[PDB]
Design a protein around this ligand. Structure first.
Ligand code: HEM
Ligand SMILES: O=C(O)CCCCCCCCCCCO
Length: 424
């Protein structure tokens, strides 16, 4: 009812702009290394900022750590419904996910899946995660450079996603392709996926594949296969969700949220730690001399990378924030990527400091009722990755400037060319 194009051009210095003309929805800001200066000007001089004009329509940017905490925690004032990316999904491809729901329904839906990351289950999966990590690292050449993104970050992420859903291992690349094309929709995040035809094909292949999986698993259960750790087994084991297939919106929304949830977040945290080490190489010497730093370092990698730059909200009513009046119905973008660089919260915020004692207080997982469900699984994979790196490699060299992904939402890497030096 009723009545887009992204081509990269050089982004000017933020000092050339009127404050009202600063548009941080531009999906090339991370790639061009202008994002830090743009968010700093907002934090300093317009921390609750209204952009009247953008390809996504108008929106507020909330850029200080303390103000983002308030917006994220205050779901009575700032709704996550109906979407949490800045723009809109293409027509015909809106799916309800509980990341874009408010309590109480949010809490009900999250409760139906949260067992898949139960701490007892993560512990039992440590052997498999570590095996995959070591096998992947042992397979890498040490006599020439290679692209870390496909060989390590995407490889490990795809196996993890297959495990979460007990998805056919040989088809696991499909979970990643489907997640990429959803999160990368041009109309939603300024990503490079602008062919609505391929999105319609995916959305239908995926729904057909999840239904086959559900039916295969219920047929396998009916034939006596013992239930496992995966999401489908858990849903089919609980009275509330044993019939979830008959609720197509809930069924597709829960399965897709789990796959998108861990797809480029994992991947880009795995890559981003190497980039941060490359910029701050003394931290790798510190790590080798004190390997017990790995858990805190994992938090600092996640803070410094901030794999998801924001989550969006809609004001439920007029709200005074930062000396501005956000109007009812306005979109409000919580820029975690800015909050984690806010010097009001973190001293020397742009430095990667792997023993930073407050690194765990970052906002890369958000805060409030939507605080990332997969946080401990993300931390676990990163811990095991770095433990297995330290066993094998005395040095890691980045041999070319990394290529960064076009998106205003995912902060990530498509090319990361690495040369390994094995230890003695
Ligand atoms: C370093 C890795 C990750 C980062 C930075 C990250 C980031 C986030 C963020 C920012 C949110 C929303 C927070 C908010 O609105 O307040 C979120 C929610 C969520 N994440 Fe993650 N995520 C990561 C890994 C994962 C993994 C591995 C999974 C699944 C295994 C996952 C599943 C989810 C789900 C299901 C939600 C929705 C939670 C809710 O709405 O209650 N995430 N994540
Ligand atoms: O399908 C829709 O309706 C819109 C989906 C937009 C993309 C959803 C992105 C969710 C990323 C969650 C990552 C959590 O760790």
């Amino acid at each position: 009812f009723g009545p887009p194009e992204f081509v990269e051009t050089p982004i000017p210095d933020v000092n050339t702009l009127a404050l009202e003309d600063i548009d941080v929805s531009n999906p090339f800001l991370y790639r061009q290394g202008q994002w830090r200066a743009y968010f700093k000007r907002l934090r300093d001089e317009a921390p609750v900022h209204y952009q009247k004009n953008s390809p996504f329509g108008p929106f507020w940017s909330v850029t200080r750590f303390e103000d983002i905490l308030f917006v994220d925690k205050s779901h009575d004032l700032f709704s996550a419904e109906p979407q949490i990316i800045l723009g809109d999904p293409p027509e015909g491809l809106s799916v309800e996910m509980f990341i874009a729901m408010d309590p109480p329904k949010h809490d009900v839906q999250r409760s139906s899946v949260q067992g898949v990351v139960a701490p007892k289950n993560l512990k039992e999966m440590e052997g498999l995660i570590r095996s995959r990590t070591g096998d992947v690292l042992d397979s890498l050449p040490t006599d020439k450079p290679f692209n870390w993104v496909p060989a390590v970050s995407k490889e490990l992420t795809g196996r993890m996603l297959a495990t979460l859903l007990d998805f056919p291992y040989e088809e696991r690349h499909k979970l990643v392709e489907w997640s990429d094309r959803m999160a990368g929709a041009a109309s939603a995040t300024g990503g490079e996926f602008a062919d609505e035809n391929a999105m319609f094909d995916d959305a239908a292949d995926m729904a057909r594949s999840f239904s086959r999986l559900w039916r295969d698993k219920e047929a396998r259960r009916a034939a006596g296969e013992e239930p496992g750790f995966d999401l489908i087994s858990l849903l089919q084991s609980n009275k509330e969700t044993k019939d979830l297939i008959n609720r197509p919106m809930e069924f597709i929304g829960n399965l897709t949220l789990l796959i998108v949830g861990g797809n480029d977040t994992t991947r880009n945290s795995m890559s981003g730690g190497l980039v941060a080490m490359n910029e701050f190489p003394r931290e790798f010497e510190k790590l080798k001399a004190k390997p017990e730093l790995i858990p805190n370092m994992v938090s600092e990698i996640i803070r410094w990378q901030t794999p998801l730059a924001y989550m969006r909200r809609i004001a439920k009513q007029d709200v005074e924030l930062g000396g501005q009046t956000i109007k009812k119905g306005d979109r409000v973008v919580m820029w975690y990527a800015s909050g984690n660089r806010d010097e009001r919260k973190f001293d020397n915020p742009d430095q990667f400091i792997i023993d930073r004692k407050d690194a765990r207080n970052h906002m890369s997982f958000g805060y409030g009722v939507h605080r990332c469900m997969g946080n401990r699984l993300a931390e676990l994979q990163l811990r095991i990755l770095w433990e297995e790196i330290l066993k094998r490699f005395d040095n890691i060299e980045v041999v070319e400037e990394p290529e960064r992904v076009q998106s205003n939402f995912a902060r990530g890497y498509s090319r990361l060319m690495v040369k390994l030096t094995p230890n003695s």
